[PDB]
Amino acid sequence: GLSDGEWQQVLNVWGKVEADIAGHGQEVLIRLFTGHPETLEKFDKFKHLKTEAEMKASEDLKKHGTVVLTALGGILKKKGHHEAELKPLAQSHATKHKIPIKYLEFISDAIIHVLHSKHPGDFGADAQGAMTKALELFRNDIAAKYKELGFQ
């Protein structure tokens, strides 16, 4: 678990994220797709995207980023009391989309990177620590659902 002080930084930061949800979502998906191009054959709608320029011009990628970060926001705002919100998403990713948990690790890293890159010298050391714990908490509760389903 995180402290109250820690939860407060996380939710402070997410409020800022929410001011520019599309632009944050776009950058997080582009970071993932470019650093780990195999994530991209999970997506028929995205397989044509052969360049960074094409990824950035794509309205549908923006729309997708908005869906993703909005779902992550709902979870985060539960301050660790997220069983009902986390459950369906763990179940769909393991069962239908078949996403290894290592891609959840990659996207967590993508978020911390994008935060510094969009707000250079505005993303405090205390802020990075709280967010990182928030993201690890999330990943940890996912791993428990993944073990339950024997997903490798």
Ligand code: HEM
């Ligand atoms: C922060 C972690 C993530 C969150 C909050 C999230 C959120 C979502 C949401 C809300 C949906 C739509 C409803 C559903 O199918 O459950 C979705 C669908 C999907 N996700 Fe994720 N996702 C995450 C990570 C990932 C990653 C890392 C991948 C692949 C590398 C992935 C692949 C997919 C696929 C293939 C779909 C189906 C797309 C569709 O219905 O068009 N997800 N995700």
Ligand SMILES: O=Nc1ccccc1
């Ligand atoms: O729909 N879930 C996704 C999460 C991150 C990247 C692409 C899709």
Ligand SMILES: O=Nc1ccccc1
């Ligand atoms: O930011 N939300 C979006 C919704 C539809 C298309 C593109 C972006």
Ligand SMILES: O=Nc1ccccc1
């Ligand atoms: O744009 N349609 C979507 C459906 C499910 C997840 C993300 C996007």
Ligand SMILES: O=Nc1ccccc1
């Ligand atoms: O690692 N699989 C996931 C579980 C829940 C939401 C997104 C991804």
Ligand SMILES: O=Nc1ccccc1
């Ligand atoms: O059965 N698969 C597992 C998934 C996550 C953690 C441990 C086991």
